[PDB]
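Quick one: Ubiquitin carboxyl-terminal hydrolase 16 from Homo sapiens, structure tokens please.
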Amino acid sequence: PVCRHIRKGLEQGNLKKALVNVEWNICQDCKTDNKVKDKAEEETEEKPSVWLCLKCGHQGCGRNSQEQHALKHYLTPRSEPHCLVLSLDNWSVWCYVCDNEVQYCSSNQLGQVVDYVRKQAS
Ligand SMILES: [Zn+2]
Ligand SMILES: [Zn+2]
Ligand SMILES: [Zn+2]
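--- reply ---
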């Protein structure tokens, strides 16, 4: 019928707090990578896909990046799955644990939040 990992991958409460002064379309995990000096290699001026964890508001870069930090975040061993990311590109949802693209509606929390987060980033 739908994905049932909604709550498992979407946590509205911590979303609100994350998106407050969050950076939009900016994989924060790129920025928080103090290891390197660049975190944005101006010579290439990259703009990868940006997937936002619907679970915590962690913004990562998807497949179109070298790091694919969004997936690293999924592959991160943790108690909650955080397996829901929405694309700031096509506004799709990806559920890593479903391993497909998720669809939602107006009564579905995922849709509600995507709508909300879209209002955030808008
Ligand atoms: Zn990144
Ligand atoms: Zn997360
Ligand atoms: Zn799912």
